[PDB]
Paper text:
Purine nucleoside phosphorylases (PNPs, EC 2.4.2.1) are cytosolic enzymes involved in the purine salvage pathway metabolism in most organisms. The enzyme degrades (2′-deoxy)nucleosides based on 6-oxopurines to the corresponding purine bases and (2-deoxy)ribose-1-phosphate. Purine nucleoside phosphorylase (PNP) is a well-known molecular target with potential therapeutic applications in the treatment of T-cell malignancies and/or bacterial/parasitic infections. The results are supported by a crystallographic study of eight enzyme-inhibitor complexes and by ADMET profiling in vitro and in vivo.
To obtain information on the binding pose and interacting residues, crystal structures of recombinant MtPNP in complex with inhibitors 18c, 45b, and 45q were determined and refined to high resolution. Inhibitors 18c, 45b, and 45q bind to the active site of MtPNP through eight direct and three water-mediated hydrogen bonds. Central phenyl moiety interacts with a pocket formed by Tyr188, His243, and Phe153 sidechain belonging to the neighboring molecule within the enzyme trimer. Compounds 45b and 45q have different substitutions at the central phenyl moiety. The methoxy group at position C5 in compound 45b does not change the overall position of the inhibitor within the MtPNP active site and only affects the position of the His243 sidechain. Substitution by bromine at position C4 leads to changes in the orientation of the phenyl moiety as well as the shift of helix (same as in human PNP) to avoid sterically clashing with a side chain of His243. These structural changes do not affect inhibitor affinity toward MtPNP since the IC50 values for each inhibitor are similar, leading to a conclusion that the active site is flexible and the movement of the helix allows the protein to accommodate inhibitors with different substitutions at positions C4 and C5 of the central phenyl moiety. Crystals of MtPNP in complex with 45b and 45q were obtained using the EasyXtal 15-Well Tool, hanging drop plates with reservoir volumes of 500 μL and 2 μL drops with protein:reservoir ratio 1:1. The MtPNP/45b crystallization reservoir contained 2 M sodium chloride, 100 mM sodium acetate, and pH 4.6. Pyramid-shaped crystals grew in 2 days to the size of 100 × 100 × 100 μm were harvested after 2 days.
Author numbering:
A (entry chain A), B (entry chain A), C (entry chain A): 7 to 268
Write the structure that this text describes.
Amino acid sequence: DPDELARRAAQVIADRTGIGEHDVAVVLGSGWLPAVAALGSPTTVLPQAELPGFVPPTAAGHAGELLSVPIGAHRVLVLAGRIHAYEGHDLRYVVHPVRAARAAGAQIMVLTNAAGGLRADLQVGQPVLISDHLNLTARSPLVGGEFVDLTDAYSPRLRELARQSDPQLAEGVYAGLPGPHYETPAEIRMLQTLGADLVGMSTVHETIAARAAGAEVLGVSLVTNLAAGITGEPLSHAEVLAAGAASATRMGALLADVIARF
Amino acid sequence: DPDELARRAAQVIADRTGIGEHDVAVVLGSGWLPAVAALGSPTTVLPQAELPGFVPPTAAGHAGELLSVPIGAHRVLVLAGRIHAYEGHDLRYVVHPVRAARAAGAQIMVLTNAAGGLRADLQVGQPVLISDHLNLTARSPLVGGEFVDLTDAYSPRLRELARQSDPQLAEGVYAGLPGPHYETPAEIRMLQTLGADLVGMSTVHETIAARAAGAEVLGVSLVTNLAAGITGEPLSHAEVLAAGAASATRMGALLADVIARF
Amino acid sequence: DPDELARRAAQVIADRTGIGEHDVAVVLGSGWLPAVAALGSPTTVLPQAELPGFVPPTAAGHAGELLSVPIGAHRVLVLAGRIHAYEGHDLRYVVHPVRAARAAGAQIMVLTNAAGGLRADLQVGQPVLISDHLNLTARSPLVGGEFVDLTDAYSPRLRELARQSDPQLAEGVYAGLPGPHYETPAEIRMLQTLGADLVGMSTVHETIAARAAGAEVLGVSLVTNLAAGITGEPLSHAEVLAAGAASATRMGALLADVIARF
Ligand SMILES: COc1ccc(/C=C/P(=O)(O)O)c(Sc2c[nH]c3c(=O)[nH]cnc23)c1
Ligand SMILES: COc1ccc(/C=C/P(=O)(O)O)c(Sc2c[nH]c3c(=O)[nH]cnc23)c1
Ligand SMILES: COc1ccc(/C=C/P(=O)(O)O)c(Sc2c[nH]c3c(=O)[nH]cnc23)c1
Ligand SMILES: [Cl-]
Ligand SMILES: [Cl-]
Ligand SMILES: [Cl-]
Ligand SMILES: [Cl-]
Ligand SMILES: [Cl-]
Ligand SMILES: [Cl-]
Ligand SMILES: [Cl-]
Ligand SMILES: [Cl-]
Ligand SMILES: [Cl-]
Ligand code: NA
Ligand code: NA
Ligand code: NA
């Protein structure tokens, strides 16, 4: 049962961190892992593979960490690494971290991602708040009769707090695709038609599960490249990592500054 | 084999109803179940869970009924409850009722659904004939080399009969999504671009399977809400049920009136 | 492991053909199988079902052949028949032939398909070069962290060579859908919005796997019908086969002429 696995994981988290409730959770994936060093100093570091329900039996050798980090007056669970849908496992693994974090007390989920920029104004290394999303995966993490409204899924209140940290922050619509291939130029022209400003390979199911669980969500993209066809140059995964490493200090300091306002 | 399970189910239906052929079938899901009481008086009521192939081993406790109802001069199989794709089981469960109904003699399938209204003209409680659909599930119920043309999938002849019952009936294009989450406002703007007038979580596979089996299809949506982003208010599943209960008499009397014209 | 199965298949191919490296591969599916007789004279003909990894245990009775054909100065592996995604098996079966062909030495993949024409200029029996694609399947054949850029997926260099064979060849964007049902007219209007010129049921995963493996790709569609809603007439699978048989000589001679330029 997903709820039961989430409660079991939250109990292990409380026991191993010695902290009974974490009120905020942050998910870092590719593009954002370097930012951990500027975000804060963990008081507990746990391998995801040691926690119930996090890592598929299939491969345990590539999973990241769960961190307990004090940020302002909060106790923050930081997921340092995602198991992406493109690994080919059930979505329960994608959204179990959100569900476990909620069961541990998290009222707010900060979901970070890397993205390709579709919109005219965007630059490599630019953070962009997610105002809404397009789920283009043809999937949902909700199974059976679990209904959730996604109006204001990306909390307006939390985007306002982020704009206090940086009043020039852009905001835009994120298209979540399966991956792991990059899009063709024709696909990017299609996404422009569909109203996407950003394109990536994560996040949409985490947002849905978070809202279904009653948590508020803040989404932040790092633009790692302009999308296929815009510059004419080929894309490469090296760009994602390079942008993450280059932006690390700024991005960690931004997240810490915003979370302290919660 | 799906054909074999459909023939076995049709034989149980004939045996238990005492009726050798049902010439019409109706599928009622959320939004439409209250209409049964105005549609007619069943002569046989069977739990779906007692019929071969209807209900996944996984959960038998939420499935509805199969009714045998005389409507005009017809003998009508009424599926009172669907197993939706969002329950997470193979599509064979979604379309097995259509295939079983065909094997029982059904020449016409009336597929009802609840929908969110995308178009400017629509109101809560309004019935809308389905003129065409957009299958946005990335799935098909047809497996292997079973080809079907979907031109005039929603029989023009049957829509004309429905307009005899009510000459002011609107018609529009239904977008079938996986569900079970509601759409974001950005998703609804996308669906408007794609040409959808109605959005829901059923029907498209039933229509495909019906056409592949050689049955004519009439589709009828009940608008239960305007789609996300139109009013600015959040959506809720309570709206679907409330609209169904409020419209019950009108909707049952409409279906009976149209089916009598077949 | 897909790589291991591809290497095992390539070793069987080398052993049974007596040819240590095939430098070009061609995939023929519905619409194109008749063209084999004009393409060349195979030196070895193997059932796909005898080769590691080609055919699912589920059904071995419908799979085609693998041919070794000398075309110009090349040694060409010709896949005479595809196992389509709509058969319902893992994508590894879809893309295993490309991966096996690469492991056998193939530097260039020629991927043929049948398609419905969405664009104003197109005629039944017309070959059209694929300039780009839209993958509308919500799937990828790449599993885990295998990243590939799809800029110039359909090699500009190879399309130029094809235009030497026939300077009037049209080019357009191919939309790959799951199938096996045809599209509704509303779906076709949607695909026009999304920028598709051609619509079919194959190819996109083969292209992705080919690019990930480091092969160049040439894509060629045969227009077998105008898409749903354009003429108003219903579509039928008979049209695909009839167009394939009628175009056989021209299409085989075209492929041979282009491959000799590689
Ligand atoms: C190319 O390989 C990857 C692998 C993983 C991710 C997401 C990781 P996350 O931080 O969400 O956990 C991305 S995201 C990404 C940046 N630019 C593009 C692009 O142009 N198209 C589509 N997607 C992306 C790209
Ligand atoms: C919100 O929960 C549900 C659950 C089930 C159904 C379908 C049942 P059926 O009668 O087809 O068997 C719907 S349908 C529906 C009404 N308004 C919307 C909307 O705005 N978006 C998308 N879909 C719907 C909604
Ligand atoms: C109708 O049945 C089939 C079965 C198989 C294929 C593809 C075989 P391939 O050569 O790629 O291996 C097609 S392709 C096709 C032609 N016209 C249409 C159309 O109008 N819509 C969508 N698709 C097609 C159609
Ligand atoms: Cl990650
Ligand atoms: Cl990273
Ligand atoms: Cl760039
Ligand atoms: Cl129902
Ligand atoms: Cl109801
Ligand atoms: Cl409303
Ligand atoms: Cl084939
Ligand atoms: Cl053929
Ligand atoms: Cl035609
Ligand atoms: Na995740
Ligand atoms: Na059903
Ligand atoms: Na294939």
